[PDB]
């Protein structure tokens, strides 16, 4: 069947200043089929209170979801988004760069 | 260009239960409703505050249409699974987009009802709103089954009455958020990759609606070939984010401009890297 | 408001 591998972007809601509350977003788009597993990580380990949007899809029929959580950034803490799908042999871990 | 769209997705899980039906309704790029058949007691729920008001008949009835639609899709999969003699053990996806483009005079611009099987165009409703189009032989089988039923008559009445009428009501009920334009906030950045080149990345943030055009230009000439352009992404709070980037040889940064078109801006915005 | 019921494919 026709299968498309997810594009993943990891970013915050607003530009991140330390000690100021914000949201960590992990946006997954352009994938097919819909079944997909997504976890957000803090310094390696899972974050538990993660919400997500309802399954929708673009003009070319490919799916997108947003996984997000409130957080408070810190110079030392490292964040990421882990993403498993059929088209991947291995779960992809994408590091949050701070650039926006 | 105001719009309501419903996005249905039915996926088969042959060795683990009935297929799952999930539907989400948008007015433009703002979600207002969902139905998930894997929910505990499945009902159509509000996802925006400008439809929470609607009475019990409204919500009971939408739910009623949703449950009946989920039954037809399970059936629709079961049938289509036949029409390609596919094993009863691989998962399969049916997707549907139905909705309305509104006009200047509060009138119908364009109605939709299209589908796709396993991520691919299967059958669609034509512009006139009383004729169909298929992709292969297998969707000819459906075309007869839908002409016989007079589906394009009952969809035309839906998307010429109900959809336009109820869109207009949603736009008016959620005017504070649906019919504002919040144009983009912008900056340009410069990251060196080597001694001799740097990525220039033009950022648009805090915009609604999502439709936006970002482009890079070297002395007027678009750099359509060199411009990396991520998919627009939600900020989480109703606004969107996008960037466009172009690797420029250092020394020549001043010949580059970033051009930006969005509903919330009346003139194109032109932007450059100022050291 | 959602589309009305149509015969399966
Ligand atoms: Zn308007
Ligand atoms: Zn060099
Ligand atoms: Zn180089």
Numbering used by the authors:
A (entry chain B): 0 to 99
B (entry chain A): 2 to 276
C (entry chain C): 1 to 9
Paper text:
HLA class I molecules, encoded by HLA-A, HLA-B and HLA-C, are highly polymorphic and can bind and present a range of intracellular peptides to cytotoxic CD8+ T cells, as well as regulate innate immune responses by interacting with killer cell immunoglobulin-like receptors (KIR) expressed on natural killer (NK) cells. While much is known regarding the role of HLA-A and HLA-B molecules in protective and aberrant immunity, comparatively little is known about HLA-C. Compared to its counterparts, HLA-C is expressed at lower cell surface levels, is less polymorphic, and has evolved to have more extensive interactions with KIRs, thereby playing a key role in regulating NK cell responses. To elucidate the role of α1/α2 domains and the peptide-binding cleft of HLA-C on differential expression, we solved the structure of HLA-C*05 in complex with a HLA-C*05 specific peptide, SAEPVPLQL (SAE), and HLA-C*07 in complex with a HLA-C*07 specific peptide, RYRPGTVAL (RYR)27. HLA-C*05 and HLA-C*07 differ by 22 residues, of which 15 are located within the α1/α2 domains, with ten of these being involved in peptide interactions, namely Tyr9, Thr73, Asn77, Lys80, Tyr99, Asn114, Phe116, Trp147, Glu152 and Arg156.
The structure of HLA-C*07 in complex with the RYR peptide revealed canonical P2-Tyr and P9-Leu anchor residues, a large network of interactions at P1-Arg and a secondary anchor residue at P3-Arg. The P1-Arg in HLA-C*07 was stabilized by aromatic residues, similarly to the P1-Ser of the SAE peptide in HLA-C*05, with an additional salt bridge formed with the Glu63. The large P2-Tyr sat into the B pocket, stabilized by a hydrogen bond with Asp9 and van der Waals interactions with Tyr7 and Tyr67. In contrast to HLA-C*05, the B pocket of HLA-C*07 is deeper due to the smaller polymorphic residue at position 9, which is Asp in HLA-C*07, as opposed to Tyr in HLA-C*05. The P3-Arg of the RYR peptide, which was buried within the antigen-binding cleft, acted as a secondary anchor residue when binding to the HLA-C*07 molecule. The absence of the Arg156 in HLA-C*07 (replaced with a smaller and hydrophobic Leu156) allowed the P3-Arg of the RYR peptide to fit inside the cleft of the HLA-C*07 molecule. The buried conformation of the P3-Arg is facilitated by the presence of small residues at position 9 (Asp→Tyr) and 99 (Ser→Tyr) in the cleft of HLA-C*07 that allowed enough space for the Arg97 to move away from the P3-Arg. P3-Arg is stabilized by a hydrogen bond with the Gln70 and salt bridge with Asp114. While HLA-C*05 uses a large network of aromatic residues in both the A and B pockets, the HLA-C*07 B pocket lacks two of these tyrosines (Tyr9→Asp9 and Tyr99→Ser99). The presence of these smaller residues and Asp9 in HLA-C*07 is consistent with the preference of P2 Arg/Tyr for HLA-C*07-restricted peptides, as previously reported.
